[PDB]
């Protein structure tokens, strides 16, 4: 089990390429994030393929559904054995509560349950189309407070908001950075970030092993 | 291809139970919906299995992500060959436009691209926690108009709102009910294009006979 806070994003469109990157690195050095594109293409067998190679996996599908269905989906991810799974806080308190409750029987096998608040791509003009007039940051803080109240394990949060969030929501509440947009990984850790998703800077480097080693050497 | 507007929801937790039901019915009598639970359990191969049996499939995963990621996921669904796929309108206009653009190279073989507006399960009190002070129906209408403006094919909409939506958004804009009261016949009369039906069929005493009773009314 790695002691690195890095989670490397697998955003490949091809199984062979993805696994050609994953064999080059080492489960001791990072965890892996499987997102919508890879999961729609390959399904849970790809996650099993990563587990069999010794990696722990953040299943980043951002479930957003009615409470029962979200509950069943999170339980399915728990049965798949993943380390972390997320939901949209925009699904509301009852949906978040249903997901948390679906995971409690899993006890120590339960994945970490993290909520997306505001996506990184959302600016004020995107939000106003939807009736949201709080700034992205204020809306995110609001949704993060709702997530903590529902008992979830943490939120996805930019490093720029991590000191604010640790002060308001507490040291125990986990912050995961999304890997898209300044702070170095070391500075993001200093801010209180618990897990940092890193994508292209590692997967698109000429030496992803040395890149990842250099990131870890700083943390 | 089917003339029925019915889409039966496959919310089994086991492949064998799901396929036993699918073996009893026929693709001429309905299409099928594959949601989060079955897809997280079985993946795209389950969709392929349904296609091999002749069914058209609504892949109901409610993608809600940054624009580029939602676009790649919708393209993956198109590659899989599904009949309908959905996204959350709550993902915003740029996300929906990205999904629309991702399907253009698939042309007429693209899935229908439908947006979830407000989930059936959301009441006013659930929306208020999010800062939304409109009624579910009024918020849904706002998100539906946004979906039309972005050029998507339609929305998931209760039958109780279909008359309003056909008047305001036009006949060409597709309405899909979620099946989560109005009868299927009344829903069709109100303007519903496709109706999702789940446990009323799959947990009935005789699902083939239930489905035939529904189709006879339509």
């Amino acid at each position: 089990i790695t002691s690195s806070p890095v989670v490397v994003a697998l955003d490949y469109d091809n199984r062979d390429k993805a696994l050609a990157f994953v064999e080059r690195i080492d489960p001791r050095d990072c965890r892996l994030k499987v997102g919508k594109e890879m999961f729609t293409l390959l399904g849970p067998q790809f996650v099993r393929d990563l587990h069999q190679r010794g990696f722990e996996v953040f299943l980043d599908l951002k479930f957003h559904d009615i409470p029962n269905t979200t509950a069943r989906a999170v339980a399915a991810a728990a049965e798949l054995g993943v380390w972390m799974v997320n939901v949209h806080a925009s699904g509301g308190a009852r949906m978040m509560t249903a997901a948390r409750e679906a995971l409690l029987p899993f006890g120590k096998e339960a994945p970490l349950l993290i909520a997306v608040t505001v996506l990184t791509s959302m600016e004020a003009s995107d939000l106003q189309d939807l009736g949201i007039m709080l700034s992205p940051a204020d809306h995110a803080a609001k949704l993060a407070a709702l997530t903590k109240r529902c008992g979830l394990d943490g939120v996805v949060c930019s490093a720029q908001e991590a000191v604010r969030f640790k002060q308001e929501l507490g040291q125990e509440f986990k912050l995961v950075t999304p890997g898209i947009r300044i702070m170095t990984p070391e500075q993001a850790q200093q801010a209180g970030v618990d897990y940092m998703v890193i994508g292209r800077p590692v997967t698109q480097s000429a030496d992803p092993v040395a890149t990842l080693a250099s990131i870890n050497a700083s943390l």
Side-chain angles (χ1 to χ4, degrees), chain A residues 1-107 109-171 173-179 182-189 191-219:
Chain A
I1 305 291
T2 184
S3 53
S4 170
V6 180
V7 188
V8 171
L10 301 178
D11 285 335
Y12 299 89
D13 62 6
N14 171 259
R15 179 175 190 279
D16 289 338
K17 283 179 63 226
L19 294 167
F21 163 81
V22 165
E23 273 303 289
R24 294 186 55 179
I25 47 164
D26 186 309
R28 305 172 59 266
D29 297 339
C30 72
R31 296 184 176 86
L32 306 173
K33 184 172 80 62
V34 178
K36 272 177 186 61
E37 185 182 22
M38 296 220 72
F39 197 89
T40 306
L41 289 166
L42 301 171
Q45 182 57 51
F46 184 55
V47 175
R48 296 186 193 106
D49 293 334
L50 298 174
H51 290 163
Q52 281 285 67
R53 293 163 163 74
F55 288 88
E56 287 181 309
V57 176
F58 175 19
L59 186 54
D60 168 25
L61 302 174
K62 302 191 182 69
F63 298 140
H64 182 177
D65 216 309
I66 70 177
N68 186 256
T69 298
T70 306
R72 288 188 275 99
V74 165
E79 279 171 349
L80 186 62
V82 303
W83 161 77
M84 179 185 279
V85 69
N86 58 4
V87 303
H88 272 277
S90 300
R94 295 187 295 107
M95 188 216 74
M96 283 195 282
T97 288
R100 179 186 63 92
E101 283 177 343
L103 289 185
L104 289 177
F106 288 89
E109 309 294 338
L112 296 171
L113 186 53
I114 299 291
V116 174
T117 58
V118 174
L119 300 160
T120 59
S121 44
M122 298 297 289
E123 192 35 53
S125 58
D126 307 300
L127 287 178
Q128 290 195 358
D129 289 337
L130 304 172
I132 298 305
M133 298 304 165
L134 285 178
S135 74
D138 281 345
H139 191 65
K142 178 165 184 59
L143 268 42
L146 189 68
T147 302
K148 180 187 179 210
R149 163 182 286 243
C150 291
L152 271 62
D153 289 312
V155 291
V156 175
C157 173
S158 79
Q160 293 288 312
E161 302 288 303
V163 160
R164 176 199 185 168
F165 276 28
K166 288 287 177 179
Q167 292 190 6
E168 268 150 38
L169 302 173
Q171 226 62 49
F173 194 69
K174 305 249 170 275
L175 307 182
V176 181
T177 50
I182 286 167
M183 277 192 238
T184 62
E186 161 165 16
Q187 290 160 352
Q189 190 173 54
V193 168
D194 293 288
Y195 302 102
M196 56 192 81
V197 175
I198 298 182
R200 277 144 145 68
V202 167
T203 62
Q204 286 194 353
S205 75
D207 194 345
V209 179
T211 291
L212 179 63
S214 176
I215 291 166
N216 279 319
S218 76
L219 291 165

